[PDB]
């Protein structure tokens, strides 16, 4: 049994998730910078709307490290609907077999947290 290591991102508009270049990989203290690369995969639930007609809810997006999860066979950057690639500077373009996916029986999801940059590069950058 398999799951994203992280909780989902809720998309609030109509547009797909977008991330600044070099951002989008969830924070994870005990992670190597070689590993900071993967994809978000969209999931959409449907329920009845206020008019009784089936409708889509806000899509949720789940992160998977590169080479793991439902699209473990996709190479980084491959175009596919419902898939958003993200990578941090210095990440290695290699499958993250050792990280794999989360077994929900043994671990709860890690709260997905993104980095917070400055509006423009400043300070040392």
């Amino acid at each position, epitope marked *: 049994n398999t799951a994203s290591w992280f*909780t989902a991102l*809720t998309q*609030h508009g109509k547009e797909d998730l977008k991330f600044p270049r070099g951002q989008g990989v969830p924070i994870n203290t005990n992670s190597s910078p070689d590993d900071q690369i993967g994809y978000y995969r969209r999931a959409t639930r449907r329920i009845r709307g206020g008019d009784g007609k089936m409708k889509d809810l806000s899509p949720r997006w789940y992160f998977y490290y590169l080479g793991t999860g439902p699209e473990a066979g996709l190479p980084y950057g491959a175009n596919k609907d419902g898939i958003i690639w993200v990578a941090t500077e210095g990440a290695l373009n290699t499958p993250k077999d050792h990280i794999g996916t989360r077994n929900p029986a043994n671990n709860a999801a890690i709260v997905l947290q993104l980095p917070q*940059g*400055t*509006t*423009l590069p*400043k300070g*040392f950058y």
Partner: antibody
Amino acid sequence: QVQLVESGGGVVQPGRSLRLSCAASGFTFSSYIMHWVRQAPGKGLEWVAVISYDGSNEAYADSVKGRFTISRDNSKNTLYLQMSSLRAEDTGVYYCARETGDYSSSWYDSWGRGTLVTVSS
Amino acid sequence: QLVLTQSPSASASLGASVKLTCTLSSGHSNYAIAWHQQQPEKGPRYLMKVNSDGSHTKGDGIPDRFSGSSSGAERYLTISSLQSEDEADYYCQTWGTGIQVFGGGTKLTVLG
């Protein structure tokens, strides 16, 4: 004391152009990132534009991109906003704001008094 | 997708205390925010930066009766010993690479 004084607001016909200015004093202007922020009557604050210390980098809210530019004259301690293709929904008070000098964050630590921009016939 | 949610209004009695709430959208529960006060017919004034661990840093000249705190995706501004001058719209501000975001603002009214 840090001071930011906005000028140049007034009436502008729709589709026309208008430049705002902000005169800064009381600190080293060229050491700080500077922002424009606006507020339509009775609504909230909305970020407009940002310019780096030396004017080499910039960014814009999606609602003004391709119509407004931001610029900076460090010798004269002045920040500008060139507005073009103005629409009625650009009406409001425009504020100059100073980004903190903190290296790791971008909150505003000082605000101007604002200048009113009226897009109307 | 980076969105700050504030309730439109709040009220409390003179001399009492009030807690205003800003909520970060999903994935940003670790972000710091800033609180700004806009008194009637005035421009805004920076109050405070609030971090996700609950710590906060007042601006210069801001009284001790203003404090900040945090829990999960929520950031709080607490004002005690409420005075008439404390009636204002309060805005939370946050930031990220290429972006600057404001909440809708909370109008505070001081009764009695």
